[PDB]
């Protein structure tokens, strides 16, 4: 019966009562259901509740934690990119910046023309698994 708290913004998305808080944090890139589970627990927030509650001041702390993973003890392994090819330490990348770095890996791998890039550019599958019947229809 607690209505009056329903506006939140986690980067470039609106985070209202649609699901649980953490699962509503999952609208952006670099933030999965387990990574959103952690940042709210690094912020000590019950992710059980609703994002139509829990106003932005908690979330502005959550903004500081998703931008600073290792600084808030989101450790080196938990990251979407560990020890990256760009910003070479252990960076959890976020909503709009991961879409850069996912391309920035593969666009580099074609300038290097490594096998990851050569498969990805030629319409081929990056993975060496079978593409005779799958990866198509």
């Amino acid at each position: 019966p607690e209505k009056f708290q329903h506006i939140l913004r986690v980067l470039n998305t609106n985070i209202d009562g649609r699901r649980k808080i953490a699962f509503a944090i999952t609208a952006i890139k670099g933030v999965g259901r387990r990574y959103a589970h952690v940042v709210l627990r690094k912020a000590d927030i019950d992710l059980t509740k609703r994002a139509g509650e829990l106003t932005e001041d908690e979330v502005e702390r959550v903004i500081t934690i998703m931008q600073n993973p290792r600084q808030y003890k989101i450790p080196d392994w938990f990251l979407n990119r560990q020890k990256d090819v760009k910003d070479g330490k252990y960076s959890q990348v976020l909503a709009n910046g991961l879409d850069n770095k996912l391309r920035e890996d593969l666009e580099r791998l074609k300038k290097i023309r490594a096998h990851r890039g050569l498969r990805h550019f030629w319409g081929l599958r990056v993975r060496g698994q079978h593409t005779k019947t799958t990866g198509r229809r």
Binding site: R34, H37, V38, K42, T48, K73, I74, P75
Partner: protein, 141 residues
């Protein structure tokens, strides 16, 4: 008696509070962010399962002659969901389950004994049968 005469799901929670009544249960440095098991799609809701897991361990070691690291790792895990592949039983983390064991050994709830590992402490045989009566007198499932 045993602790098998009293309610086991009350027992893993009344002894969990008893390990909170211990005040320390020697938690690892990594429960806010861990996988903690390759079975689990999500990180735990809290950290207070660790009391319950040791309340589930000390009940388990009350019945054994002694057990340790590999034995706890089959208890709390289950089907490892293999995604596009068939799911299968395996064992998760062996560090935090050992951290459970060194805690109850450190609190003398269980203790390194025969049969390769930790059996009950006699203080634990008190403190389990103490809170067994606390389990039994409260409710009987």
């Amino acid at each position: 008696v045993t602790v098998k005469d009293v309610n086991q799901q009350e027992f893993v929670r009344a002894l969990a509070a008893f390990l909170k009544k211990s005040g320390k249960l020697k938690v690892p440095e990594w429960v806010d962010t861990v996988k903690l098991a390759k079975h689990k799609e999500l990180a735990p809701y809290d950290e207070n399962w660790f009391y319950t897991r040791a309340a589930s361990t000390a009940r388990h070691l009350y019945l054994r002659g002694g057990a340790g690291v590999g034995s706890m790792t089959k208890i709390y895990g289950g089907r490892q969901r293999n995604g596009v592949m068939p799911s299968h039983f395996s064992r998760g983390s062996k560090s935090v389950a050992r951290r459970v064991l060194q805690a109850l050994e450190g609190l003398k709830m269980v203790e390194k004994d025969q049969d390769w590992g930790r059996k009950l402490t006699p203080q634990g045989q008190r403190d389990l049968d103490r809170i067994a009566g606390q389990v039994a007198a409260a409710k009987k499932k």
